[PDB]
Design a protein around this ligand. Structure first.
Ligand SMILES: CCCCCCCCC(=O)O
Ligand SMILES: CCCCCCCCC(=O)O
Length: 258
């Protein structure tokens, strides 16, 4: 019923606020220059990066490892959020692991869009702002790492979704019954059905003007999956070229293998 869907929407949003310290509302307040929030230190070159360390191996590797640490933190936040989705903790333990293993990256890039604009990305809980041009200036293959994410974010941000919309969308992503190696797909699809229903009512009530936003949002999955596929290919290159560079155990378990 409609009231039950509104209740599910409210639960997920409340639960999202508790799991993710830097929301899209806080991120937009920082980027647009609002009084609810302070201005970030901008990193656009090597000098601002060095000063930035004071305010906030080689440069390219150091930045990459910084992104790897934030990814670990994000995985932790997503795992805590997943546990609050009704029915998730009641699923087979191997399926819970499988849903998180494949789901987190898709959620990482969805939530990364909230911290981005066409010019750059908010870093270290919004204290910093690293420019896109600087990240693109990095030596190969590191220069190519964030560019497809910026390309996705520009398109995704045009949908003008808020945190309450994103809370249900990332729940829908987690409960994907088409992940490889799942043992019981039906209770997963059963939860996703209710999540899809809650998302549809949320988008119709929150964005009444925005025609077919529901379909438009579900279409963004292809782009998300593609981002994930490309990202995986890029780490394989690094693994072979930078044999002294170590990847966090949590990330190693998620990445190998997809
Ligand atoms: C809680 C999900 C937030 C995504 C931000 C993680 C950024 C990861 C990266 O720089 O690649
Ligand atoms: C020397 C660290 C360079 C920072 C790379 C980006 C880190 C992302 C973050 O702090 O959220």
């Amino acid at each position: 019923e409609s009231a039950d869907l509104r209740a599910l929407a409210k639960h997920l949003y409340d639960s999202y606020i508790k799991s993710f310290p830097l929301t899209k509302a806080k991120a937009r307040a920082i980027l647009t220059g609002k009084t609810t929030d302070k201005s970030p230190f901008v990193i656009y070159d090597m000098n601002s990066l060095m000063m930035g360390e004071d305010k906030i191996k080689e440069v390219a590797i150091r930045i990459f490892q910084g992104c790897q640490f934030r990814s670990v933190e994000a995985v932790q936040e997503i795992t805590e959020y997943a546990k609050s989705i009704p029915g998730f903790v009641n699923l087979d333990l191997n399926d819970q692991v499988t849903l998180l293993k494949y789901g987190v990256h898709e959620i990482i890039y969805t939530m990364l869009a909230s911290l981005m604009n066409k010019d750059g990305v908010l870093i270290s809980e919004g204290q910093g702002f690293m420019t896109r041009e600087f990240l693109k200036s990095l030596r190969k293959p590191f220069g190519d790492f964030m560019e497809p994410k910026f390309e996705f974010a520009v398109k995704f941000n045009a949908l003008e979704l808020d945190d309450s919309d994103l809370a249900i969308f990332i729940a829908v992503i987690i409960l994907s019954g088409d992940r490889p190696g799942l043992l019981n797909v039906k209770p997963i699809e059963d939860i996703q059905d209710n999540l899809l229903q809650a998302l549809e009512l949320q988008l119709k009530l929150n964005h009444p003007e925005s025609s077919q936003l529901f379909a438009k949002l579900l279409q963004k999955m292809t782009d998300l999956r593609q981002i994930v596929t490309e990202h995986v290919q890029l780490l394989q290159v690094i693994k072979k070229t930078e044999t002294d560079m170590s990847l966090h155990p949590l990330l190693q378990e998620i990445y190998k293998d997809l």
